[PDB]
Nucleic acid binder design. Sequence first.
RNA 1: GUGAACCGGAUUGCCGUCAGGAAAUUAGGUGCGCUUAGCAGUAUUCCCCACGCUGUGGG
Length: 182
Amino acid sequence: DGKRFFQADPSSRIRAITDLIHEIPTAHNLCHFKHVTDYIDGLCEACCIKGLLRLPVFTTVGGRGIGAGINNTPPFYLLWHANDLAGMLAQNWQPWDNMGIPAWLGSFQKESREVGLLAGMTWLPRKVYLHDPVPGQAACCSCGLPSEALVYSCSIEVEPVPKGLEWKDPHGVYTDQGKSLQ
RNA sequence: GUGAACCGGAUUGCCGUCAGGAAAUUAGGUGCGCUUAGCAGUAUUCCCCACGCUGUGGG
Ligand SMILES: [Mg+2]
């Protein structure tokens, strides 16, 4: 009960924790290649963290009344590769003069125009709560690790992206007209 | 009992109506198939059996 990582205040729109993961079917999706059922199988803490990190980069439209993320349709992502973590960090180090405030800090604000790097790289288009883990002896449906109490449900609300918001992704690829290249 | 098990690309359709290969052509000029022979007057007729010191009977 306090500050949460990549989360916000609770709501009443209850959804099973499966829409954070694209490959596991949920709601109206057909469960043929992955036999799952909502509120029956859940994810562990590591998978919850890994699914909270997919919001800024891999969020698509929700149909009616729900928009996409900061990058609109998720485009190609091109970067540089190295044989170790330090090398990969050292080959894509280019900083900017304006950094902004990261999302894991205090309550993020859209505020005025311009974004920077830390704010843009951690844009949160949805509010999520991650209620609690429920005791049991099941296994995670994402990694398969035989574990203990998992989470099953959460609350998700939609945050619209204000008009304007001049942003250029360091890794995204754009077209001639400025649209995302997918 | 394997990125594995459970797993249909499915339903509908005439290529029909039109057409002279036609007009004219000697395949012609030369060439012996020829030299030779009794189905008959004999001297062991290819095989087998029986009777004699040639006669019967079968192939
Ligand atoms: Mg997990």
